Amino acid sequence: NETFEKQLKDLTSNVKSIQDNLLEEIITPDKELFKKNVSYEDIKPYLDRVVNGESQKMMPWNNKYLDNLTFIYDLRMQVITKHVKGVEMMFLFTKQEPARVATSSYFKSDYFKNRPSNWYYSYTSPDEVILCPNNTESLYCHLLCGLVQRGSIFASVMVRAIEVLKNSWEELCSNIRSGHLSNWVTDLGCQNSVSLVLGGPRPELADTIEEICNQNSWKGIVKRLWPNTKYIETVVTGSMGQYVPMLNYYCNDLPLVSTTYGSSETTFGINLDPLCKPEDVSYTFMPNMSYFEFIGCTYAGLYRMRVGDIVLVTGFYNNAPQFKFVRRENVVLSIDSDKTNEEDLFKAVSQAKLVLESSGLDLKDFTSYADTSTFPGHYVVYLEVDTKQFELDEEALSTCCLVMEESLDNVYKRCRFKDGSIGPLEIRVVRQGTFDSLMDFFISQGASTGQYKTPRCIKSGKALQVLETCVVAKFFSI
Ligand SMILES: Nc1ncnc2c1ncn2[C@@H]1O[C@H](COP(=O)(O)CP(=O)(O)OP(=O)(O)O)[C@@H](O)[C@H]1O
Ligand SMILES: [Mn+2]
């Protein structure tokens, strides 16, 4: 609207002045002297000092979601309201926690309950289902309410949300008839609210659902159940890019839209161009939460903190700069004097999936592990493949083994070829739904549901045998 456009204009130019005002509002409870004056691994001795007892520098936690997330949600609501019409069922999760937790700090906060409710903040899933500590029951509640409906934080969850429906349909069909939530749903909120949603039986929808679901092709399925949905909202940037092409098969190729970029430290900014395809999607940063200041180059509670993620400038309106996410620092694979990171992995798997694509297969998911047990220590990748023992092509993936190697840095290839520090790259083929079972492992181990993204390197190593157990075959380079 006029007000939204006006505000968006007021955010320009935010480069220095407004960011310095926010910096002053921060500091008080000039900027040159601060710059001449002013990581969590570094802050760990300093940050853990305030946790010294339970059952104090600053006041935890008024930061972030209070003054940040609601603003973002509303503004992006108005953005998609501007770029899309007719919009005037999302998957989010909370688990049992006095500590900062995921986006669940928002769901546990009164900014969520006192949230303005119009459309964007209105959902088909009962709010009791959202906060439900049982995410397995609450997911089924989301999918049942959806089955009756007439995106998420991360993309990695979305496919799983598609996965469950693949293994379960008719149970929902019996549930809508019974008017009761499934007997194995133990949550009071889920049970009650969902039973209320079901209410009277609806065989009319049940039969046509049964007719629609049985189709032999999974191509573009999710778009059929709710055609009126214009767009998907999930992060397709970063590692989550891995999940892009799979959706387009499962969907009608409706737009995949990444609205926001933020970390545990704070929320950074939002994407101002919904017209951006997943690869060019760019996050422009907000001045109010801004620190580290600002300006085609490579680059409250926290002052001059180092974020720990890598971004590049995708361009600008010249009023404010735009940024696309590339890689994250923390994840790295190494043997001797060789650092291989997220974007090198993505490079290699991009080189690899083009080989699989020619053989009549594809790649559902991947992750990595380095084996230091035996010399030479070699790079190991775990692949889960889909056809759109049984059907094994020795050549395709043994080609995929090599095609990843020369895609990586010559550093690796120095320790690989000539000097023998590392041996031939190994690919492990895992059976169906292995990565599904693997994410089930993490959640139960104290990992957020539901904040979930698939790690591309495994240090655990308690999760390692889970992939090992499911390996169908192994293939090597050279
Ligand atoms: N849209 C996006 N694209 C790419 N990366 C993102 C992103 N949004 C958030 N992130 C990254 O993901 C992190 C948010 O949660 P986490 O991934 O669990 C932090 P982490 O340090 O990678 O976890 P770890 O230290 O346990 O491995 C932020 O550090 C941020 O760098
Ligand atoms: Mn990360």
List the beta bridge partners of residue 382: 367, 428
Which of 41, 153, 261 for mutating ligand 1's site (highest number of atoms within 8 Å of CB)?
Answer: 261
CA separation for the pair 204, 202 (Å, rounded): 5
324 Cβ below 6 A of ligand 1: no
Range(s) of the domain holding residue 95: 1-478
Work out which ligand 1 atom sits closest to the CA atom of 237. 3
Q: Which ligand is nearest to the CA of 235?
A: 1
207 marked as binding residue: no
456 Cβ below 6 A of ligand 1: no
Of the candidates 239, 236, 246, 330, the one whose C-alpha atom is nearest the C-alpha of residue 283 is 236
Question: Which token pair is 92?
Answer: 């989010």
Specify the experimental method. Answer: X-ray
Burial class (CB in 10 A: 0-12, 13-18, 19+), 227: exposed
For the chain, what is the domain count?
Answer: 1
325 Cβ below 6 A of ligand 1: yes
39 Cβ below 6 A of ligand 1: no
Kindly provide the resolution of this structure in angstroms, with one decimal.
2.9
299 marked as binding residue: no
